Amino acid sequence: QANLMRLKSDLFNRSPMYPGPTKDDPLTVTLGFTLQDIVKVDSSTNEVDLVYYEQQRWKLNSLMWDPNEYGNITDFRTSAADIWTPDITAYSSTRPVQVLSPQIAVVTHDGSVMFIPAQRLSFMCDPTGVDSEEGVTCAVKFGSWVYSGFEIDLKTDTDQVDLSSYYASSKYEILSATQTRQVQHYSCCPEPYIDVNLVVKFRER
Amino acid sequence: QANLMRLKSDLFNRSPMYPGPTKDDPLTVTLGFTLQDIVKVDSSTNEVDLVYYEQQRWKLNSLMWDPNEYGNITDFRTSAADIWTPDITAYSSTRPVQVLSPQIAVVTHDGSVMFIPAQRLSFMCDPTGVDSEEGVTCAVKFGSWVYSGFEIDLKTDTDQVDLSSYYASSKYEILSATQTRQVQHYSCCPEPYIDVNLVVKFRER
Amino acid sequence: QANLMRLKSDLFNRSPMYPGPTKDDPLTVTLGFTLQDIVKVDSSTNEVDLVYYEQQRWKLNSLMWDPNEYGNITDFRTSAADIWTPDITAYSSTRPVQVLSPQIAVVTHDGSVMFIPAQRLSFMCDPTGVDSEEGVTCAVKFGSWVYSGFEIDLKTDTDQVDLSSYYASSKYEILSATQTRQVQHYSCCPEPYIDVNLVVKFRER
Amino acid sequence: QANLMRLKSDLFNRSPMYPGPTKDDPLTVTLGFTLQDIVKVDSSTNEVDLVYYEQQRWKLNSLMWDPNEYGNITDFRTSAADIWTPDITAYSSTRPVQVLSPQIAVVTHDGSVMFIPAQRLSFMCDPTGVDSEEGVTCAVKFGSWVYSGFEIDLKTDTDQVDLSSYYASSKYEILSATQTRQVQHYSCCPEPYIDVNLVVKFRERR
Amino acid sequence: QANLMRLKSDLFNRSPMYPGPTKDDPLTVTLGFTLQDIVKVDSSTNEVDLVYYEQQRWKLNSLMWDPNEYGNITDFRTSAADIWTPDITAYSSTRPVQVLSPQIAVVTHDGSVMFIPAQRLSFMCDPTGVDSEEGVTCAVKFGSWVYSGFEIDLKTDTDQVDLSSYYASSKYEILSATQTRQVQHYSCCPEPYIDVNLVVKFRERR
Ligand SMILES: NC(=O)c1ccc(-c2cc([C@H]3C[C@@H]4CC[C@H]3N4)cnc2F)nc1
Ligand SMILES: NC(=O)c1ccc(-c2cc([C@H]3C[C@@H]4CC[C@H]3N4)cnc2F)nc1
Ligand SMILES: NC(=O)c1ccc(-c2cc([C@H]3C[C@@H]4CC[C@H]3N4)cnc2F)nc1
Ligand SMILES: NC(=O)c1ccc(-c2cc([C@H]3C[C@@H]4CC[C@H]3N4)cnc2F)nc1
Ligand SMILES: NC(=O)c1ccc(-c2cc([C@H]3C[C@@H]4CC[C@H]3N4)cnc2F)nc1
Ligand SMILES: *[C@@H]1O[C@H](CO)[C@@H](O)[C@H](O)[C@H]1NC(C)=O
Ligand SMILES: *[C@@H]1O[C@H](CO)[C@@H](O)[C@H](O)[C@H]1NC(C)=O
Ligand SMILES: *[C@@H]1O[C@H](CO)[C@@H](O)[C@H](O)[C@H]1NC(C)=O
Ligand SMILES: *[C@@H]1O[C@H](CO)[C@@H](O)[C@H](O)[C@H]1NC(C)=O
Ligand SMILES: *[C@@H]1O[C@H](CO)[C@@H](O)[C@H](O)[C@H]1NC(C)=O
User: Fold this and answer.
1) Ligand 1: residues whose CB is within 6 Å?
2) Domain ranges of chain B
3) Which among D150, D195, D204, D197 has a CA at the least distance from the CA of D178?
4) Do A77 and E146 touch (CB under 8 A)?
């Protein structure tokens, strides 16, 4: 307890909070999805609801420490309000995301942060044909809402979505699920934005 | 990091917050809409639900800085709670607006602020005839709830709503969409209020 | 800006907040309704939903100032959390009221305050007969929940509800709408409570 | 204004907040219900929705004052966040309670507090037979969730629920409504807990 | 009052908050469920809704005190925001948990804490066959979301879920209900996580 209280005090009480990334000190966030369930499709509004968790990983110099000065602590859990977190947003959602897990992240001595929020998302998707053998494909882009590619870049560790926790008695079975980095240009804005495109192909079980 | 922390400290910790516009120092807010989806119509209550994002832009002297005094920083991202934002309100909503994007704005060295909230809005609209070839037209006014034209004026850069992110497999297709400045007089109040009228004509796809 | 920051500082930072009205210093609140839409009726639960805005007006000595000492400022906008507001409550609601406008009031140099919240209210009302020529009548009382007539009195400027913003394509048309001061006694309590009774007569369009 | 600001400052800024009742300084809370409407029944989930207000009354020494030292003020209104309030909970609810009135209480010079929250409650109730002449009976217990009878006791002033504000055009009419003190033992916990059992008998209006 | 205000001040104002368990100072949380109602099943989405309360118990050195230094106070009630509480999470929920009881815990002089939140949970469950004599079985794992078995361990006092407060007029009857410790490995993570698996077998009332 004593060593950890001291470490947290030194990282969070002694400085102002990290103000986020800049063009001079950009940040790369690693994203990965673990898909748990396609809960419902609404064919009258073209909305689909997913439950998943989203692994987020980044690294800051201001969160480094030497374990020997703090009783060999290599990592700790902390409330996500104590730290900056990236503003990763689904681009075609139709409702506010519902949070299904505690807002707690893990910080490691090299300055890396891992944050794995579980979410339920409603997004735009036409499920016509879901009851056929071929199924339907739907897609949703995840990226920073406010930072361009000059401040936040994204990457994945793999292009395969993790399906090993997928609910075996779901109404829908997954035929494939990929997660892929893309670059986008928008009408509002001259600079490239980065996203990860989650593409899921599914049908009725 | 260091230069930005210093800049934010100088703009926000050294003064009281901007108390909003006055008759002596009025403010012009530029509005523009990007329509993403007409999600649903309810013909039994005459309510329609849109998903869009609303570009808001204004300029304050108290947010100016010289880039050379702060490591050539020309702009930064900041929480919308750190700054004043205009109280832009839909005049015929039937539910509280749901916020679909992070509450983060971008401030530029000339004192200009850009804020682009994504929203889902339920508003008053009769969808009878939506299943015909001619479609239906619906309209909603956006403006300040509490400031008259003597404190807040509005403008648009174009009268065409941006449709380039419109969901291609929506239940509804858009025939036209305009955004137009207007002046209104109300029973309660002797002074002109300004709004932007969003007029959307649509039908079943 | 400078004059207004100074005025707000002198009214709000230099004293404790107004603790509300007393028997020695009672307060009169003026109420008026502007009815926008009867959104739905539920004949299986006897609930009706209205959208309206409610004009509230009162006057305090502690909010007076001389305009000449503050750059000729005659009024200003301020967050409703910065000031006391009356606890006006619908007496037959079935859900929490939903707030559809920003919580911002206007204070004038004579000490008068105006606050105009837009609301959606579900309340108790039997809509049987709404589809006939004669229509139905429904009523809801608005008053302080906790202050009797010895601390808060109410009045209206007119007994006619403002119908000039009523949605022209509503499912329901308004035949009449009145707002009238009344005195009530309740089982819990020996002292008179004051309310304004909103009586609306309507039918299917 | 001046006298009241001064009184509130003396009661709330000069001390730490009341930490709640103890075995040495127990508290009696008086409860009473005023039933406004049975809004709906759901026979597919066995849930019923009531709208009521709940009168709560208790007394603390730390809220006493002499009226003569404060301009003859005998009582005042204050936000319920400024004071401790009892944690009265429905024991068979199926949704969070919805609050329909402002969170404001009235404190009197003898140290007594009155707080009357209006609420909408969904609770467990089988409405099968509601459309008959005999109706259905449903019941819900209200009590402290965390304090036993050694710290919080409950009482009623009357066993009759107040029906004088009952909505006359409700879908349901009330045949009877009682509010009655009871003592319960729970498996988790060695002390008796006190509740008030609200029993309502109703049917479809005819 | 005076002794308790003093005790609370000494435990909460004089130090920083407990930063949670570590590999060097791990923590064991005891869990137990009391099932009140299966409120609904949705066979079109495979979601089931339960109402229960979850008894949580743990022990910290930093919450110890000697009763003789504080007027023989052996325990007290305190807001759950004043203390650390474990981040126990259902692993197959489809909605945020709804809280049905006040967020108040009880701390005892030996440093032990008891916290008993009542909750409504929607979780993944196929109710096909619920209308038969054999019924359906459904399961949900409860565990820390962020702490592995090296920081938080779990146990139960019994493997039988408490059914003595189960609503007698529910749409569903319970045939059996167990609560059992398990060890899991996940794709994200090399270290063991501990959970308690709540297994409930039920059918439509007949
Ligand atoms: N260079 C600048 O001054 C500046 C100003 C504002 C923004 C911005 C951009 C976005 C949109 C870009 C992408 C598509 C829709 C939103 N996400 C959202 N919010 C913002 F504040 N970006 C850059
Ligand atoms: N001249 C004054 O002292 C004053 C006082 C109050 C208001 C005001 C006006 C409005 C309504 C005007 C428009 C239509 C409905 C609302 N938005 C809302 N909230 C307000 F506080 N405006 C000016
Ligand atoms: N004389 C006193 O000490 C005192 C105490 C409490 C109240 C009070 C009254 C009400 C009810 C009056 C009206 C009908 C139902 C509620 N609204 C609600 N909340 C309250 F706190 N009024 C006066
Ligand atoms: N003597 C003690 O150490 C102790 C500890 C905890 C509790 C307690 C009891 C309850 C339950 C008792 C009743 C049935 C369910 C809940 N309401 C809830 N929350 C609590 F914190 N009571 C006593
Ligand atoms: N020491 C580390 O490198 C590390 C990093 C992150 C996490 C973590 C793990 C989890 C998942 C474990 C279990 C199954 C899915 C989630 N709950 C959630 N939130 C977290 F922050 N644990 C360990
Ligand atoms: C930390 O590491 C070193 C061994 O390299 C050891 O001397 C020390 O005692 C360890 N643990 C603590 C709690 O200090
Ligand atoms: C800032 O601008 C000057 C002038 O062009 C440049 O020479 C200097 O290297 C810049 N400093 C930075 C990017 O920190
Ligand atoms: C205030 O009023 C006087 C008299 O009309 C005028 O001369 C002065 O310019 C006004 N404005 C300010 C900011 O003092
Ligand atoms: C309190 O009431 C008495 C009436 O008996 C009166 O004389 C006195 O003025 C009042 N006190 C104050 C401080 O107003
Ligand atoms: C605590 O209990 C003792 C008996 O052991 C009693 O005599 C004393 O009055 C109590 N109060 C204290 C120690 O403050």
Assistant:
1) A 145-146, 186, 188-189, 193; B 75, 105-106, 108, 114, 116
2) 1-205
3) D197
4) yes
Chain A residues 164-203 within an 8 A CB cutoff of chain E: 164-165, 167, 169-171
User: Which residue's CA is the nearest one to ligand 10's atom 6?
Assistant: E72
Residue A68: which residues within 8 A CB-CB, separation 6 or more?
A: none
Q: Provide the 10 A C-beta neighbour count for residue B163.
A: 15
Cα(A125)–Cα(A139) distance, rounded to whole angstroms? 8
| Residue A46 touches partner B, C-beta closer than 8 Å | yes
Atom of ligand 6 nearest to the CA of A3: 13
Contact indicator for B78, B130 with CB cutoff of 8 Å: no
What resolution in angstrom units was achieved for this structure? 2.5
| Secondary structure in 3-state letters for chain E | CHHHHHHHHHHHCCCCCCCCCCCCCCEEEEEEEEEEEEEEEECCCCEEEEEEEEEEEEEEEEEECCHHHHCCCCEEEEEHHHCCCCCEEECCECCCCEECCCCEEEEECEEEEEECCEEEEEEECCCCCCCCCCCEEEEEEEEECCCCCCCEEEECCCCECECCCCCCCCCEEEEEEEEEEEEEEECCEEEEEEEEEEEEEEEECC
Structural method: X-ray
Contact, C103 vs C117, CB < 8 A?
Answer: yes
| Separation between Cα atoms, residue C171 and residue A172, nearest integer Å | 39
Alpha-carbon dihedral angle through residues C149, C151, C157, C162, given to the nearest 10 degrees: -80
Among D61, D81, D79, CA closest to D21 = D61
Report strand pairing: B110-115 vs B98-99: unpaired
Residue range E1-206 forms a domain whose CATH class is mainly beta
Q: Give the CATH number of domain C1-205.
A: 2.70.170.10
> How far is D154 from chain C, CA to nearest CA, in Å?
18
A72 lines ligand 6 (CB under 6 A): yes
- Is residue C75 lining ligand 2, measured as CB closer than 6 Å? yes
